[PDB]
Symmetry: C3
Subunit: 314 residues, 3 copies
């Protein structure tokens, strides 16, 4: 597959710093080289310089609003750029708040995109339902057309325009949802597969349905937002908001191997990897390594093996 | 849901002490408060004072017979009491031998109850088939109507009267069954799902069947006996009789989430949590925390989220 | 079941030494006694003395060719011997290269055998596709009739004669396959269930199919080649070529419990257990213990329990 790598060292969508190092440790882990080791055409668009916004007091309850909306606005234009270059945008990031810019920059070029959101959280709190004020748990509320009119005018998000509808998104791996978030899920009839559904059906069926759900009517470009906390902390420990009972390494690879096989992946996000939150250097590499394997899977790496269109027996 | 909490600090059903601390660490973990944090009506009936029985020599091979039968007799009347108060009895306990009193006190008020027994063991040894003599591995043999006439007159259990039939109980999670126990399973045609069946069918089907099995004919009150050793020791390490290859955290939550959804849970047991057997203070909290989540699930806590009958968007 | 135990302390099929201790730690773990504890008729044929071959320079890229082909030749005749004694051959070994001798010695007496290969690797590299040269990753290429004419004349393997066809083998647990290996899989139409298929279908279906695949047409003798690295390293850490995302303890027991139930197991291999590669003495026992349980399962040990044809209630 042909990628467009976008480094996004940002963290103002949540409290803990160090998630801005994600693009760094991932690159160092050798991700770009491992991609080229496959049938991949890779172009690094560099790491986005998210300049400081010293004057960014809270907006009611929302924290660092101007800083957040800015990094998303900057990211959206970059993602749009690479999609214009006929390349799958790989946004290696910090916190999940950057999903607003990615999905927005993606939809500008591909207004018919479908979104798959692998996460332990729905991150669909409104600036009015959020109890923490951290924007990495509200990205979705900003992107839904149905919620347009419920979201306040937050400093830094004037450029924003709801690009996705409730029936164009699927959630997978949910196990920590707030009440208001749950009310939004049921009311707008959003399709999701919480860990309960995963245990019930199996990841194979869950994926069968998810794909049938988002591509049944017709084929469309897929945007995969992967929050590393969707996977169990025994696999991705170094992350800010971990939650026990997560998707397994295998389930994570299965999800992505299946996504790849559709040949419709056009947008990818690898979020919440925070090297600093690892209790041991092994938890940091265990996280990063897990984060890389998921990415590679997105672009062709299959557990049953891979081979070029040649005769290996000669 | 509306509960009736019953603390049961008992341990004479097995060798290791410290399981009598279970009600204590569970309460301290904040279980009662977490229940009220939900749509729960909670009434604490206190911790039962299980006075000593200094004169309790063995009965053939059975250990502490008078002490055991006594704590069960005391518990049975308490459970009956709370069920008379229209409340689901939550028996936080020590060893599993206390199941005799719970299920008995439950059936007095609800003679048509169905039993689900999540455990790594069938605990159906008779005082005559038991090779260890520990009563926390024989509770079931005392409660079956079909085995009435095979069980000797053990000091402390004269009050006992078999209240459940072989076709009213389902086992889930079996992986360590004695030969005599197995002979009883097959001979009385008891329905069970050992880890083998779980791996084969999946926990979703296993539950589908279990419920269809116990409620198909008609709806009846359910009594859930949960032995914390049914779950894998990587989740509930601090327990006396651990066994590898147990149910997963997720499978445990799935089982209970499904039980809750029937709206027929009327009796619950949280057994074998022994703080003292933890190799680290983290194994103790990992166990207790796991023990709490399972309880909460029984009363409504759903992984996909929860919300009150209000308009969260206002 | 009735077994013929064959100790195979060999390691020249791979770089790390210490895997030759496998038969030792397994025996010490009490495997032979645990088998007799069941309905098993056990005869220990001792540990094969694999004399050194000081003069064994590489053959092109292949390492220790003369040493390897020799231990396989010796093992083949032993396996043939025990199968002639109407006994299931249990080859406790070192590296997986010994599969060549086992499957060969097995087929001499049972030319219609079916092979199930539980491994993280297909070990089907040819001396010409192998990039490492380690023979414990090529055993299969030596045994396939379809590859006869592609394999060079390697010093030590003149006695060898391809006894199995591509449609008589099933792979389970694959997650690390080389490109040439993958080309051979697809080209010869070999049936396999990589971890992807396991996650998709479940281990219950995977086994359903595997068995239907190898026994559908007619019943035939089964040879189970179990590489301990097929299971996840969290279960079998002390092994040379570990790979994350492996089969679970439960899945491993399920596979074998199912194999046993066919009543067609005639050949078994327990390979790659290397005590020396354990980071802790607990990783060594965790591996060995896991290795034993799998063996016992092969011969009747069922998680739901076991009982003799007697009346336990008397
Ligand atoms: Co999350
Ligand atoms: Co998120
Ligand atoms: Co138990
Ligand atoms: Co029990
Ligand atoms: Co292997
Ligand atoms: Co192997």
């Amino acid at each position: 597959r042909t990628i467009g790598i976008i480094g996004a060292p940002f963290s103002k969508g949540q409290p803990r710093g160090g998630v801005e190092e994600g693009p760094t440790v991932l690159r160092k882990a050798g991700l770009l080289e491992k991609l080229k080791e496959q049938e991949c055409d890779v172009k690094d668009y560099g790491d986005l310089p998210f300049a400081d916004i010293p004057n960014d007091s809270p907006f009611q309850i929302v924290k660092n609003p101007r800083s957040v909306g800015k990094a998303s606005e900057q990211l959206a234009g970059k993602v749009a750029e690479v999609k214009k270059n006929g390349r799958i945008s790989l946004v290696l990031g910090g916190d999940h708040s950057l999903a607003i810019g990615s999905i927005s920059g993606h939809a500008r070029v591909h207004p018919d995109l479908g979104v798959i959101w692998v996460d332990a959280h729905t991150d669909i709190n409104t600036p009015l339902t959020t109890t923490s004020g951290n924007l990495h748990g509200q990205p979705v509320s900003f992107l839904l057309k149905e919620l347009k009119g419920k979201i306040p005018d937050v400093p830094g998000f004037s450029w924003v325009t709801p690009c996705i509808s409730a029936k164009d998104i699927v959630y997978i791996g949910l196990r920590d949802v707030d009440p208001g978030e749950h009310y939004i899920l049921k009311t707008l009839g959003i399709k999701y597969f919480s860990m309960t559904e995963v245990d019930r059906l199996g990841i194979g069926k869950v994926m069968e349905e998810t794909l049938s759900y988002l591509l049944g009517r017709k084929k469309r470009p897929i945007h995969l937002s992967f929050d590393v906390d969707g996977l169990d902390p025994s696999f991705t420990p170094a992350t800010g908001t971990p939650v026990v009972g997560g998707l397994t390494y295998r389930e994570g690879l299965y999800i992505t191997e299946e996504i790849y096989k559709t040949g419709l992946l056009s947008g990818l996000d690898i979020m919440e990897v925070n090297p600093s939150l690892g209790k041991t250097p092994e938890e940091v590499t265990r996280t990063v390594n897990t984060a890389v394997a998921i990415t590679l899977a997105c672009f062709g790496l299959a557990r049953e093996g891979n081979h070029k269109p040649i005769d290996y027996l000669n």
